[PDB]
């Protein structure tokens, strides 16, 4: 570490880590390695192990900067730089490939890959135990550790890799996803946005420059103590964190991490700053301009805020949202982490939320979504992304036990408001781009709802029962 790195230790308060991640983001840049032990440190204290707690964990010079000269010993000991020449100021995918294999072959042979609290610095020098995305943040901060200066995190909605080299234009898988069922550790992923899956986002993925790293990392604190309890300490922190990228411009391409600071801001609003609805939106607005409107999360994060709020037409309005950047993906083999998210939406959470509103309106509510058509509308076109994502992928999206839901969500809507949805063809009013819910036009709208026909139309089952 540097001198000037040094003056603000020892950390006492949430306030004293803020200052020093202010430090270090004025800084040419932030040091990624410092950062994380820092965060990892008073995460195990305040989320891990509470032992002797009485405010704050205090973060000693000394302990961090043994930990520090721990990894970067580990690091620069391991890679020989002298062994892959750098032409350019920028890195060989050689030299990617064996910071990867160091930090790989540093971690436990077994363990709960799924664990929460292994994501820092910390957990991989004290515990050797990295999570998925946490490889790729170590395989990133050891090559800043190094000097190499061009290779830079690159994120997915649900996966990590680098990017490097010349003009920062070569991609390197660095870690496992999900079950570890494939690798291409050191490939390119070229052929997963050639193959148009949710996974590589058709390359409208997340470019991190080292501001952007610094705020994955404190997106990735996780303030969970346990499955009832977090820790409030920590939430601040995260919140705190989060403010000061804010303000000095860092989040302009991150959408996720607005939409986990408007969800902390839900929880405890802080004076004088934006409600939790313009932090969802400029979310959205931030993946409209930057990642020409690809990403399915900024409106999941808009739908739970609404869902939580019982604002069940705005709920509709943000998942139909979510559907239509879903329709111009391809279900490809890996990208069963959003398959669930649509599942969980579509056949318990939507189905909880109408049955609630038929409740409400037995007992006279006005307004209620099941007398707006608008309602309706959406949940047609939520249900009309999900059948155009289906189109033409390798794997097949819906079954039966979706069309037992969709018939019970359309019947909790009357045939006299069902009827005032208008659906046009190309070349409340709706448009359907998927063939499924094309034929399905006339059977939605009808006074009595065909439940058999229904469920064939939506799963394309061919026979009924023979006797
Ligand atoms: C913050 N930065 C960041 N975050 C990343 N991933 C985040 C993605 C969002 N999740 C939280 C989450 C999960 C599910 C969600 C939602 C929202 C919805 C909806 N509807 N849904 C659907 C589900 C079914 N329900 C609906 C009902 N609600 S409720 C009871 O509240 O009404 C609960 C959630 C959210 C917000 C947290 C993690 C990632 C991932 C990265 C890639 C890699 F590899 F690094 F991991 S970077 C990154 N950054």
């Given at each position: 570490?540097?001198?000037?790195?040094?003056?603000?230790?020892?950390?006492?308060?949430?306030?004293?880590?803020?200052?020093?991640?202010?430090?270090?983001?004025?800084?040419?840049?932030?040091?990624?390695?410092?950062?994380?032990?820092?965060?990892?440190?008073?995460?195990?204290?305040?989320?891990?192990?509470?032992?002797?707690?009485?405010?704050?964990?205090?973060?000693?010079?000394?302990?961090?900067?043994?930990?520090?000269?721990?990894?970067?010993?580990?690091?620069?000991?391991?890679?020989?730089?002298?062994?892959?020449?750098?032409?350019?100021?920028?890195?060989?995918?050689?030299?990617?490939?064996?910071?990867?294999?160091?930090?790989?072959?540093?971690?436990?042979?077994?363990?709960?890959?799924?664990?929460?609290?292994?994501?820092?610095?910390?957990?991989?020098?004290?515990?050797?135990?990295?999570?998925?995305?946490?490889?790729?943040?170590?395989?990133?901060?050891?090559?800043?550790?190094?000097?190499?200066?061009?290779?830079?995190?690159?994120?997915?909605?649900?996966?990590?890799?680098?990017?490097?080299?010349?003009?920062?234009?070569?991609?390197?898988?660095?870690?496992?996803?999900?079950?570890?069922?494939?690798?291409?550790?050191?490939?390119?992923?070229?052929?997963?946005?050639?193959?148009?899956?949710?996974?590589?986002?058709?390359?409208?993925?997340?470019?991190?420059?080292?501001?952007?790293?610094?705020?994955?990392?404190?997106?990735?604190?996780?303030?969970?103590?346990?499955?009832?309890?977090?820790?409030?300490?920590?939430?601040?922190?995260?919140?705190?964190?989060?403010?000061?990228?804010?303000?000095?411009?860092?989040?302009?391409?991150?959408?996720?991490?607005?939409?986990?600071?408007?969800?902390?801001?839900?929880?405890?609003?802080?004076?004088?700053?934006?409600?939790?609805?313009?932090?969802?939106?400029?979310?959205?607005?931030?993946?409209?301009?930057?990642?020409?409107?690809?990403?399915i999360?900024?409106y999941m994060?808009?739908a739970?805020?609404?869902?939580?709020?019982?604002?069940?037409?705005?709920?509709?309005?943000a998942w139909a949202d979510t559907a239509?950047v879903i329709?111009?993906?391809?279900?490809?083999?890996?990208?069963?982490?959003?398959?669930?998210?649509?599942?969980?939406?579509?056949?318990?959470?939507?189905?909880?939320?109408?049955?609630?509103?038929?409740?409400?309106?037995?007992?006279?509510?006005?307004?209620?979504?099941?007398?707006?058509?608008?309602?309706?509308?959406?949940?047609?076109?939520?249900?009309?992304?999900?059948?155009?994502?289906?189109?033409?992928?390798?794997?097949?999206?819906?079954?039966?036990?979706?069309?037992?839901?969709?018939?019970?969500?359309?019947?909790?809507?009357?045939?006299?408001?069902?009827?005032?949805?208008?659906?046009?063809?190309?070349?409340?009013?709706?448009?359907?781009?998927?063939?499924?819910?094309?034929?399905?036009?006339?059977?939605?709208?009808?006074?009595?709802?065909?439940?058999?026909?229904?469920?064939?139309?939506?799963?394309?089952?061919?026979?009924?029962?023979?006797?």
């Open positions: 570490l540097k001198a000037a790195q040094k003056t603000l230790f020892p950390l006492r308060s949430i306030d004293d880590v803020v200052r020093l991640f202010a430090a270090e983001l004025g800084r040419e840049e932030p040091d990624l390695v410092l950062l994380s032990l820092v965060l990892g440190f008073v995460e195990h204290f305040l989320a891990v192990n509470r032992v002797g707690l009485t405010y704050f964990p205090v973060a000693d010079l000394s302990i961090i900067a043994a930990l520090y000269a721990r990894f970067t010993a580990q690091i620069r000991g391991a890679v020989d730089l002298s062994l892959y020449p750098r032409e350019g100021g920028v890195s060989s995918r050689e030299l990617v490939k064996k910071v990867s294999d160091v930090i790989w072959n540093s971690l436990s042979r077994s363990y709960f890959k799924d664990r929460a609290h292994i994501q820092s610095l910390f957990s991989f020098i004290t515990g050797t135990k990295l999570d998925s995305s946490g490889v790729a943040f170590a395989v990133v901060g050891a090559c800043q550790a190094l000097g190499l200066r061009d290779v830079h995190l690159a994120l997915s909605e649900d996966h990590a890799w680098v990017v490097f080299g010349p003009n920062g234009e070569q991609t390197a898988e660095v870690t496992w996803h999900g079950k570890g069922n494939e690798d291409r550790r050191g490939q390119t992923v070229n052929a997963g946005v050639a193959e148009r899956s949710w996974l590589y986002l058709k390359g409208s993925y997340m470019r991190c420059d080292r501001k952007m790293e610094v705020a994955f990392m404190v997106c990735a604190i996780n303030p969970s103590i346990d499955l009832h309890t977090d820790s409030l300490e920590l939430l601040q922190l995260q919140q705190k964190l989060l403010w000061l990228l804010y303000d000095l411009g860092h989040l302009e391409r991150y959408p996720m991490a607005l939409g986990n600071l408007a969800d902390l801001e839900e929880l405890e609003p802080t004076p004088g700053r934006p409600d939790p609805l313009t932090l969802y939106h400029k979310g959205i607005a931030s993946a409209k301009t930057y990642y020409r409107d690809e990403h999360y900024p994060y808009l739970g805020y609404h869902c939580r709020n019982r604002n069940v037409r705005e709920a509709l309005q239509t329709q111009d993906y391809n279900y490809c083999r890996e990208d069963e982490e959003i398959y669930k998210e649509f599942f969980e939406v579509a056949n318990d959470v939507i189905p909880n939320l109408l049955k609630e509103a038929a409740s409400l309106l037995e007992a006279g509510s006005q307004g209620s979504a099941l007398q707006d058509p608008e309602c309706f509308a959406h949940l047609l076109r939520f249900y009309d992304g999900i059948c155009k994502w289906e189109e033409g992928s390798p794997t097949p999206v819906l079954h039966v036990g979706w069309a037992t839901f969709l018939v019970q969500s359309l019947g909790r809507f009357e045939g006299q408001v069902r009827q005032k949805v208008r659906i046009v063809s190309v070349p409340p009013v709706l448009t359907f781009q998927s063939e499924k819910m094309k034929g399905m036009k006339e059977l939605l709208v009808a006074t009595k709802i065909n439940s058999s026909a229904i469920k064939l139309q939506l799963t394309a089952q061919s026979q009924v029962q023979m006797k």
